[PDB]
Amino acid sequence: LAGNAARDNKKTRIIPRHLQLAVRNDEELNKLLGRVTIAQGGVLPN
Amino acid sequence: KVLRDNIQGITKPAIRRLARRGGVKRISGLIYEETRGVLKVFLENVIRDAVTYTEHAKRKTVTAMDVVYALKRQGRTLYGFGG
Amino acid sequence: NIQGITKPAIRRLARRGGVKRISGLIYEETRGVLKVFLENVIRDAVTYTEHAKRKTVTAMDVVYALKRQGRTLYGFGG
Amino acid sequence: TRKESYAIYVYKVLKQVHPDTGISSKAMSIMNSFVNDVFERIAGEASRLAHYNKRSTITSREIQTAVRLLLPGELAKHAVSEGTKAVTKYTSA
Amino acid sequence: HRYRPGTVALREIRRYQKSTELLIRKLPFQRLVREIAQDFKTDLRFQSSAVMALQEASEAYLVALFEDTNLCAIHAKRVTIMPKDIQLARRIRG
Amino acid sequence: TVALREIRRYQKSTELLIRKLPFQRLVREIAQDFKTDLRFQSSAVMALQEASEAYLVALFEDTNLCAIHAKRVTIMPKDIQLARRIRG
Amino acid sequence: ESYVRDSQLPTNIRDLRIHVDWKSQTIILPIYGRPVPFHINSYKNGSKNEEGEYTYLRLNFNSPGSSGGISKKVEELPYEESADNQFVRSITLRSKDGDRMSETFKQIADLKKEADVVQQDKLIENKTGRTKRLDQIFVRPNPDTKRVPSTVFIHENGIRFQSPLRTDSRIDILFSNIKNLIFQSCKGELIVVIHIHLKNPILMGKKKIQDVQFYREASDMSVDDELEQEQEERRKRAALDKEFKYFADAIAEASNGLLTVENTFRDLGFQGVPNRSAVFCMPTTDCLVQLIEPPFLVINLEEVEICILERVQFGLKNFDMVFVYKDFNKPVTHINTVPIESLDFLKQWLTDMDIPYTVSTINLNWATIMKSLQDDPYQFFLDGGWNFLATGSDDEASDESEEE
Numbered sequence: 001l002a003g004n005a006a007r008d009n010k011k012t013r014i015i016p017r018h019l020q021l022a023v024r025n026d027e028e029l030n031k032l033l034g035r036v037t038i039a040q041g042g043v044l045p046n
Numbered sequence: 047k048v049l050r051d052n053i054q055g056i057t058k059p060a061i062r063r064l065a066r067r068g069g070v071k072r073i074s075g076l077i078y079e080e081t082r083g084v085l086k087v088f089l090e091n092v093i094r095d096a097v098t099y100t101e102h103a104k105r106k107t108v109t110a111m112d113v114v115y116a117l118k119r120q121g122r123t124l125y126g127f128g129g
Numbered sequence: 130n131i132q133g134i135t136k137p138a139i140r141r142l143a144r145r146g147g148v149k150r151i152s153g154l155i156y157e158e159t160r161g162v163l164k165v166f167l168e169n170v171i172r173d174a175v176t177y178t179e180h181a182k183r184k185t186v187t188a189m190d191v192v193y194a195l196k197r198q199g200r201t202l203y204g205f206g207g
Numbered sequence: 208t209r210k211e212s213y214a215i216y217v218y219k220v221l222k223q224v225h226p227d228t229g230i231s232s233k234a235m236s237i238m239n240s241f242v243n244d245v246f247e248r249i250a251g252e253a254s255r256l257a258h259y260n261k262r263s264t265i266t267s268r269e270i271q272t273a274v275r276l277l278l279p280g281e282l283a284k285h286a287v288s289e290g291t292k293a294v295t296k297y298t299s300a
Numbered sequence: 301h302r303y304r305p306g307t308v309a310l311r312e313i314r315r316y317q318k319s320t321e322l323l324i325r326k327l328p329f330q331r332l333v334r335e336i337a338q339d340f341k342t343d344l345r346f347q348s349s350a351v352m353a354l355q356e357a358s359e360a361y362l363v364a365l366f367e368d369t370n371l372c373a374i375h376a377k378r379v380t381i382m383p384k385d386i387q388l389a390r391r392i393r394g
Numbered sequence: 395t396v397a398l399r400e401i402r403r404y405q406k407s408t409e410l411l412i413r414k415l416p417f418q419r420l421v422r423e424i425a426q427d428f429k430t431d432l433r434f435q436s437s438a439v440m441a442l443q444e445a446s447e448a449y450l451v452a453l454f455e456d457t458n459l460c461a462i463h464a465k466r467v468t469i470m471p472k473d474i475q476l477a478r479r480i481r482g
Numbered sequence: 483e484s485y486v487r488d489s490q491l492p493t494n495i496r497d498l499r500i501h502v503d504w505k506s507q508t509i510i511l512p513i514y515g516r517p518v519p520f521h522i523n524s525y526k527n528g529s530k531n532e533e534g535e536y537t538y539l540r541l542n543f544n545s546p547g548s549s550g551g552i553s554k555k556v557e558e559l560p561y562e563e564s565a566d567n568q569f570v571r572s573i574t575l576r577s578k579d580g581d582r583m584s585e586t587f588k589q590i591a592d593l594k595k596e597a598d599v600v601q602q603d604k605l606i607e608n609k610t611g612r613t614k615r616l617d618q619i620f621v622r623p624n625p626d627t628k629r630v631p632s633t634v635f636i637h638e639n640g641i642r643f644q645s646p647l648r649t650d651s652r653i654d655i656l657f658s659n660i661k662n663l664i665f666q667s668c669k670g671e672l673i674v675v676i677h678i679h680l681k682n683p684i685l686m687g688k689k690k691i692q693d694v695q696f697y698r699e700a701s702d703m704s705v706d707d708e709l710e711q712e713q714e715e716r717r718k719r720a721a722l723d724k725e726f727k728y729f730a731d732a733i734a735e736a737s738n739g740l741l742t743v744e745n746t747f748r749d750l751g752f753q754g755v756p757n758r759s760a761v762f763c764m765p766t767t768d769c770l771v772q773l774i775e776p777p778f779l780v781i782n783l784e785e786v787e788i789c790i791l792e793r794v795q796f797g798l799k800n801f802d803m804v805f806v807y808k809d810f811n812k813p814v815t816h817i818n819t820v821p822i823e824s825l826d827f828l829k830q831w832l833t834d835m836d837i838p839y840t841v842s843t844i845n846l847n848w849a850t851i852m853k854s855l856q857d858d859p860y861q862f863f864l865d866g867g868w869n870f871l872a873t874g875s876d877d878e879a880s881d882e883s884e885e886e
Contacts, residue, residue, distance in 0.1 A: 025797025039126030055416030068454025110437035133328030146366025150380035188350035231881035
């Protein structure tokens, strides 16, 4: 999921923004890691 | 020595930019001091647990590991610092 | 089934909560919330039993499930 | 000093899932702490389950139920399938 | 005498706050729980104390949620709770 | 109208809004109460700051939601204590 | 004008307290012992300050830099008669010496506020053999808060909504004033509806309205398994549907194919939010509308230049989109909550319309671009056109290495 987000961003490397974006957006893994905060993740558009 | 107004070091524009990252549109004036207080209470909670871990460790430095461990007790685990 | 949790009983719960006036859609929406929470607890309870190799939902397993959920219960288990 | 890192294996997993993609050291630390956290979660759940059923040894059954509990639905299904396949290949070998 | 609207409701608020009794009926709730548990493992039996535990856990959850719902309504400057309040409360709870 | 953008710019960025050194001094200030001569790791200071950042962001989300319920587009302090108490 | 002759004096000849007149919509002030009247339409605002014992009242007129945000602009009263001529902007006073000043200041506060339609051609009513009439029709916006049932008729030079079923009042709509007539059926909708969008809004009932609609409800929820209810509902929907289609053909022949009715493209529709409410968009032949629930807004596609998609990133089930028009005087609308799966449908639709589109993630004002482009329509093409939204150099990010 992180690489997929990175491919949307066009950047080859995965960054914690991509990591947090995937986690928050995917419902299932968002339930697994809801209490977690990803450092420098940011917040999703809304 | 002694420090003061460090919680006032949190700036009004910083609070407004935080609220806007969080989605707020128009911000009332009274928001700033209370957000400062909320941040303050959260920081004594975290720092108390971290310093307690260090006093157990017989160490004079508050390691990022102990920080993470305190956050884990608070139930707001963060990934990326130490391990 | 979920309809058995009826309007007088929802009103009694809301009055325990503090509510004075109650809207009508409250009953249906609260029924839905009860459905959801009961599913969440029971899944963990029955999973605990399948580990235990028992065919009955023990109250101890219920307490462990509520502990996992975080909505801990005291008294009906050791 | 030796440092206990899942990073060496996580990089292999990253290349197999996505060959050309690379990883920042910051994201790599995210993954290392992630694997540590999930490992501790599952292992602790297995330990509590061993105590609860009075078993003195953790086994694949304890781990799979711990996965069933901690993971939510879809990841729980896929994880238990992949894990039972994994112990199956290990035992068949 | 014909009680004005709201007074009897306030009386019940005091009454059931004082009481320490189960406000959902045991066999309807047991039937409900069994209906949920059909899906996960069919023909599953229940320890009765376990059923009591599910019941009081649900009671605590719904009572606290109605407290949050009423707080949402009073914040909304409306005495009557609306479903809006229940969604707001659960969304804040997360 | 720039207010409406000003939501949407910082949402993308991963930057830490709170300035680094006033947070360091605040953190050491709070530390002094529980113990002195404490020499924090810089990593520890950033770890504190990121968690604080996220906590406040979630708080303001809940606050704006409370206001939208109230039919108020302005966050008022009542929103803050309401969110804090419902979160518990 | 304030006054016209000497015969009409102020309320008192010795005006030793600052006087405010209500009948002639003006007030007098003495600037140091000799009079002057000024007008409410010539006024902007007033303000107060109290300091120690001294008091300072400020009164601001309507003038350049005061009534208008930017000078040298075009406004009705000051500029239109003379654009390069002396006016006054604001004055002050101090009347601590008498306890009569707060009274006149509050009379100012309400006098500033104390003080509107293009009239269409009268629609000629003719009861010919070809007469259109259908009942249980409700008009929206209604004349009064309560809901008005009545009938609707077509004539040769406008649309007439006859109230006599309710109150005999007459409302007239001019054919030239109608811009777009569109039908929307009950296919997945809770109403069956006829919308007429007008270019010259009309004053009716209690207020001024541009959008006019007539519909019939299709509600099924009741608060009072049987197949009789389902059969009755299906019969009602289908029979009234043939009635509506016949009526649409009738008005089509009445208009002789000029005022065409567009067919909803339900396949192309999507759950948008242009009016800050969950509404299902439904594109049409030449005018996209979202005509299910209020508040009800119509966007004319003839005056749309291009479209720009904002919030372009994965995991965005809501992303925004901008209509860049050919005329920028009117405000810009924002459809929100566009589904990801509907992006291909939007692209195909825009290609069919032959309108070039842009996809991007950056944000600037709409306000400053509108102001600058009214100032000069070509300045933005000079500074690079709509390619500026494309990012060429934002930042650089990387990492040292990751190996062990």
